[PDB]
Amino acid sequence: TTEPVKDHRRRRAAAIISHVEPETFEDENDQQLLPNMNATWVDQRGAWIIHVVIIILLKLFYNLFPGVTTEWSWTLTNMTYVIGSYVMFHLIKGTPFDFNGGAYDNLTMWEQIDDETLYTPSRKFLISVPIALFLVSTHYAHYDLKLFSWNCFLTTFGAVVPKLPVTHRLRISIPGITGRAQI
Amino acid sequence: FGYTCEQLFETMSALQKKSQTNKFIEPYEEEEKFLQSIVDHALINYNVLITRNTIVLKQETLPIVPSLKICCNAAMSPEELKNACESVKQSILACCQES
Amino acid sequence: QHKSSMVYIPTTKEAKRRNGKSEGILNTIEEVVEKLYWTYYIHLPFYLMASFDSFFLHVFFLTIFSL
Amino acid sequence: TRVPLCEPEELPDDIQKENEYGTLDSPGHLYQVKSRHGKPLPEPVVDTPPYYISLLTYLNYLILIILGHVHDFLGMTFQKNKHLDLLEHDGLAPWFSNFESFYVRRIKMRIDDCFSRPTTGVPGRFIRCIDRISHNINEYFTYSGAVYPCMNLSSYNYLGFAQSKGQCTDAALESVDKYSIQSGGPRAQIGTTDLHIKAEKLVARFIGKEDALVFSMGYGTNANLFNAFLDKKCLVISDELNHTSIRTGVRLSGAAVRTFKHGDMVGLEKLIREQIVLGQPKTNRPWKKILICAEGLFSMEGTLCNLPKLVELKKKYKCYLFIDEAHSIGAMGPTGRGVCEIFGVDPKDVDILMGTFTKSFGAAGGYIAADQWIIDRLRLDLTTVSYSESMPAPVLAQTISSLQTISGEICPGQGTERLQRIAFNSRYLRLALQRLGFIVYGVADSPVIPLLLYCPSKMPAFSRMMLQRRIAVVVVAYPATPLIESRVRFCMSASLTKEDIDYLLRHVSEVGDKLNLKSNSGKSSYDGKRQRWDIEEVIRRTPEDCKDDKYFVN
Numbered sequence: 001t002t003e004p005v006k007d008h009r010r011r012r013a014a015a016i017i018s019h020v021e022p023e024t025f026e027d028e029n030d031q032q033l034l035p036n037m038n039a040t041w042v043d044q045r046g047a048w049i050i051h052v053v054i055i056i057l058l059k060l061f062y063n064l065f066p067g068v069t070t071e072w073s074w075t076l077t078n079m080t081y082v083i084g085s086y087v088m089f090h091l092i093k094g095t096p097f098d099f100n101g102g103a104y105d106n107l108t109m110w111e112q113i114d115d116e117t118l119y120t121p122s123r124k125f126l127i128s129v130p131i132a133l134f135l136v137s138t139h140y141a142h143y144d145l146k147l148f149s150w151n152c153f154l155t156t157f158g159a160v161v162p163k164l165p166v167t168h169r170l171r172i173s174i175p176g177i178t179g180r181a182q183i
Numbered sequence: 184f185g186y187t188c189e190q191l192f193e194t195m196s197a198l199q200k201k202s203q204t205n206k207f208i209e210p211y212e213e214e215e216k217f218l219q220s221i222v223d224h225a226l227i228n229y230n231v232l233i234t235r236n237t238i239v240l241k242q243e244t245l246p247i248v249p250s251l252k253i254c255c256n257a258a259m260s261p262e263e264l265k266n267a268c269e270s271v272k273q274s275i276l277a278c279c280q281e282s
Numbered sequence: 283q284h285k286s287s288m289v290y291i292p293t294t295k296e297a298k299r300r301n302g303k304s305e306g307i308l309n310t311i312e313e314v315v316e317k318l319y320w321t322y323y324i325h326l327p328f329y330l331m332a333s334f335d336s337f338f339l340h341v342f343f344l345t346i347f348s349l
Numbered sequence: 350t351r352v353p354l355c356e357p358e359e360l361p362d363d364i365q366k367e368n369e370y371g372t373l374d375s376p377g378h379l380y381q382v383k384s385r386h387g388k389p390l391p392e393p394v395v396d397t398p399p400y401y402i403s404l405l406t407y408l409n410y411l412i413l414i415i416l417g418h419v420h421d422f423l424g425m426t427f428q429k430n431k432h433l434d435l436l437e438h439d440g441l442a443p444w445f446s447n448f449e450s451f452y453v454r455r456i457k458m459r460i461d462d463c464f465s466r467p468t469t470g471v472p473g474r475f476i477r478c479i480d481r482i483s484h485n486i487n488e489y490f491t492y493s494g495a496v497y498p499c500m501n502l503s504s505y506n507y508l509g510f511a512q513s514k515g516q517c518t519d520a521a522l523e524s525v526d527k528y529s530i531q532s533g534g535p536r537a538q539i540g541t542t543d544l545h546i547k548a549e550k551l552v553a554r555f556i557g558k559e560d561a562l563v564f565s566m567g568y569g570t571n572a573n574l575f576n577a578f579l580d581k582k583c584l585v586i587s588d589e590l591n592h593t594s595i596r597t598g599v600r601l602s603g604a605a606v607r608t609f610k611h612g613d614m615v616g617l618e619k620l621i622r623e624q625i626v627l628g629q630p631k632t633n634r635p636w637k638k639i640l641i642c643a644e645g646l647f648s649m650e651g652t653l654c655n656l657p658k659l660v661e662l663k664k665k666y667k668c669y670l671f672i673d674e675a676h677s678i679g680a681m682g683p684t685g686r687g688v689c690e691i692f693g694v695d696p697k698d699v700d701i702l703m704g705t706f707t708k709s710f711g712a713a714g715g716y717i718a719a720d721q722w723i724i725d726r727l728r729l730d731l732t733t734v735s736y737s738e739s740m741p742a743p744v745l746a747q748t749i750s751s752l753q754t755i756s757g758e759i760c761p762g763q764g765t766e767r768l769q770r771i772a773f774n775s776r777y778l779r780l781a782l783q784r785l786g787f788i789v790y791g792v793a794d795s796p797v798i799p800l801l802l803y804c805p806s807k808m809p810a811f812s813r814m815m816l817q818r819r820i821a822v823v824v825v826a827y828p829a830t831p832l833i834e835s836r837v838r839f840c841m842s843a844s845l846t847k848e849d850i851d852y853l854l855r856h857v858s859e860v861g862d863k864l865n866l867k868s869n870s871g872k873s874s875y876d877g878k879r880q881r882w883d884i885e886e887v888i889r890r891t892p893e894d895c896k897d898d899k900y901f902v903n
């Protein structure tokens with residue numbers, strides 16, 4: 001076939017388990033030219049207490065309705081926080097603002113945090129907060145293992161599992177359940 | 184001059200890929216000097232001014248060779264244009280001769 | 283000085299003091315209401331929203347207070 | 350449904366002259382700046398607001414982001430016929446997808462009335478604006494053909510050279526009469542005249558270099574300058590707050606890019622050392638050259654760069670220096686030479702100096718100055734010179750007239766009065782605003798005075814309320830700025846007088862009291878005490894005390 005002079009073609013995965021290919025020289029220059037704005041706001045002033053305030057308000061609003069049960073209210077607020085965090089961090093790929101070319105079209109925000117540097121204080125805080133919430137919820141009131149097992153399973157697999165370094169730069173594509181991911 | 188367009192294109196592409204600071208080619212310079220010689224000869228003898236195509240070779244990516252150009256506008260008269268055409272033809276014929 | 287073609291808009295205090303609108307008995311309540319309304323309205327997003335959503339959020343806050 | 354064409358107004362000469370340029374009141378309202386002689390530049394200090402403001406900002410942005418996606422999803426899923434722009438008709442993709450235009454449609458659209466405003470006439474100290482009415486939600490406008498004057502604090506005329514009656518206008522008209530408005534072509538075959546060389550030599554002498562070049566556009570100058578001498582094997586070290594034109598030029602050049610934090614020199618030195626040691630990627634061979642790009646004065650912050658430290662570093666580590674100064678070539682300095690005059694640095698230390706005429710001289714274009722053996726090579730290696738159109742005659746005449754006026758040749762004592770007036774106005778406004786209780790940025794002399802508004806919904810209220818008072822201002826926000834910090838940028842000019850500033854101070858004080866915009870701490874006053882002065886006392890005491898160079902923290 002005819003070969004292009006300059007080729008920038010997106011390639012998709014071809015296996016159940018796969019990893020994203022490391023970037024090139026031109027892509028590295030494009031990312032280094034302009035600071036990223038999706039990952040800068042996490043380290044700024046007043047960006048840590050906000051999660052605590054959100055948790056406090058979610059507890060109060062879910063407890064406000066008379067018909068709710070304390071175990072049910074805490075499970076529902078866990079639902080809200082875990083789903084919101086998963087949607088914001090791990091679900092959406094890309095940048096709302098336009099960068100040069102495709103740029104950060106393949107990585108998520110959690111991967112973009114602090115220029116892919118691991119073991120940063122913000123990451124430690126973001127991984128420690130859900131754990132503290134889980135232990136506080138468990139110790140606060142009476143519980144039965146029935147919903148407890150599923151709640152801890154969701155806490156582990158929706159908040160803890162994605163944060164491990166083993167899952168960094170990792171993509172899973174089921175042949176039919178999940179669409180193919182660009183590598 | 185003993186050179187062809189394809190050889191010049193290959194030389195320029197290789198030099199650009201190799202990232203050499205110094206990019207100098209002799210036959211291109213000789214051809215440009217020759218064309219400027221036609222321009223000057225046409226200017227000194229007769230009050231007619233023409234120009235050649237001014238390009239930067241080290242920035243181009245596609246094949247291109249030096250050339251010459253003549254422009255015209257809507258305020259001229261046919262007789263002067265015909266006289267200028269005859270003059271430039273005579274200049275080109277005189278310069279290209281003596282082979 | 284020299285005159286120009288500019289039309290100067292008087293400030294609120296000057297207009298109020300030249301209008302005789304200020305009345306001690308029946309203006310402090312109005313000023314308090316104005317302050318309470320503006321402080322509530324400015325620091326929270328109602329001003330970049332749509333009418334339906336703004337009304338919905340007003341009803342949400344009103345119900346939260348009423349409960 | 351269409352912008353009407355406004356008939357010019359017929360007025361006597363004196364009224365129009367007063368509208369364009371204002372006469373001085375008292376000779377005590379002037380200030381002459383003094384050189385620094387090279388004493389060190391201290392690290393800047395920034396004030397901060399309380400926590401609850403930031404918390405409210407975070408909640409506001411979170412709610413806006415959630416609701417935007419809710420509306421987008423519902424509308425795209427159900428009402429397809431309404432949104433035909435974002436769907437493929439017949440095997441053709443749309444011009445743009447929904448995702449990249451999210452910020453423009455969802456949050457910016459509600460504020461489109463405060464961004465683009467048509468005007469007419471010469472922009473002086475009073476600008477005439479066209480009246481318009483909004484329909485739907487800023488989708489289209491209807492115009493009634495009515496005009497009204499406003500005070501302008503948003504136009505780039507620092508020295509007030511934008512006039513319709515003056516020596517520069519006479520020179521422009523004479524040039525139009527002598528030279529036609531048309532040019533020949535690229536400045537390598539036809540299109541060069543004696544005026545071009547005269548402007549070349551005049552600019553070269555004014556700056557202090559040996560030779561120069563003049564171009565018709567500044568953005569094109571920056572976008573085409575870099576590829577002439579840079580290559581894939583070189584390295585470019587630049588700040589994080591540079592202009593877009595430099596970024597485009599570096600992208601076209603193809604070299605490697607490393608960036609350092611704003612105002613940090615320890616990090617810069619560490620980066621230079623590491624980059625020298627490591628070398629090229631994947632081969633670890635030495636770089637061919639290293640270049641440092643910076644800006645003379647930053648418009649978004651109103652702060653200066655520490656030139657002596659850069660010169661010392663480039664001398665010690667054998668590097669090259671490139672300085673971009675378009676906001677500081679005519680408005681700053683004891684005599685207006687630029688950033689090289691206040692610090693006392695010899696002009697020969699910097700390699701390449703660039704600037705534009707748009708901001709201060711009232712004409713469009715740009716230039717570049719360097720040594721003779723560099724300009725001789727560049728006149729051949731540049732692509733702007735041999736491929737693009739040339740600069741017209743009236744613009745050259747206006748630029749020459751402005752430069753000869755500032756230099757003190759054509760008129761004896763007109764430029765110095767302008768410099769003193771602009772300096773005094775900037776100092777007075779900054780000191781009065783800080784004594785009121787607001788938050789400002791700057792270095793006590795920059796013409797840019799950014800006042801900070803933090804809540805997302807306060808900028809449109811401030812803009813509309815200032816418009817109702819017949820004052821024109823410009824407000825910027827995300828992503829052009831950090832998420833938390835929004836601001837309004839004041840551009841002070843020499844044409845404004847002191848009474849205009851008093852009028853502005855009264856109105857802004859009232860509006861800030863209404864909107865709760867003044868929140869100051871003890872880090873902004875020299876005595877360490879938070880200050881809330883009453884307005885008349887400020888007006889009485891500030892203009893005398895603004896001259897002493899001790900009342901300013903930075």
Ligand SMILES: C[C@@H]1CC[C@@]2(OC1)O[C@H]1C[C@H]3[C@@H]4CC=C5C[C@@H](OCCC(CO[C@H]6O[C@H](CO)[C@@H](O[C@H]7O[C@H](CO)[C@@H](O)[C@H](O)[C@H]7O)[C@H](O)[C@H]6O)CO[C@H]6O[C@H](CO)[C@@H](O[C@H]7O[C@H](CO)[C@@H](O)[C@H](O)[C@H]7O)[C@H](O)[C@H]6O)CC[C@]5(C)[C@H]4CC[C@]3(C)[C@H]1[C@@H]2C
Pocket residue numbers: 010087092093094102105106182418419421422425426446447448
């Ligand atoms: C009280 C009640 C409770 C319940 C409730 O209400 C309140 O709670 C409410 C709370 C709601 C959630 C809140 C927040 C979100 C996140 C949002 O996040 C989307 C952001 C993504 C895009 O999504 C938008 O755009 C999509 C475009 O396809 C729309 O999809 C189709 O929409 C229609 C069919 O559905 C049809 O028009 C079409 O079939 C098609 O347009 C979608 O609808 C729309 O949202 C951004 O990511 C992508 O960006 C690119 C897309 O441009 C992808 O392609 C790229 O791929 C390569 C990169 O790899 C590049 O190189 C290629 O160039 C390039 O092609 C890229 O792969 C991928 O990363 C998705 C929705 C969700 C979960 C909401 C759901 C509804 C609720 C549950 C409400 C609920 C009602």
Ligand SMILES: CCCCCCCCCCCCCCCCCCCCCCCCCC(=O)N[C@@H](CO)[C@H](O)[C@H](O)CCCCCCCCCCCCCC
Pocket residue numbers: 037038041050051054076079080081083084085087088092096407410411414415418832
């Ligand atoms: C019967 C009851 C059953 C209960 C069932 C419970 C269901 C739970 C439903 C959950 C609904 C909420 C899920 C998603 C809502 C939020 C998702 C937003 C993601 C939209 C796209 C994100 C793009 C990021 C780019 C961007 O603009 N970034 C940033 C700027 O550059 C961004 O604009 C700012 O920084 C603001 C974000 C900071 C605010 C703090 C959030 C942290 C805590 C998250 C908890 C969420 C709780 C929701 C109430």
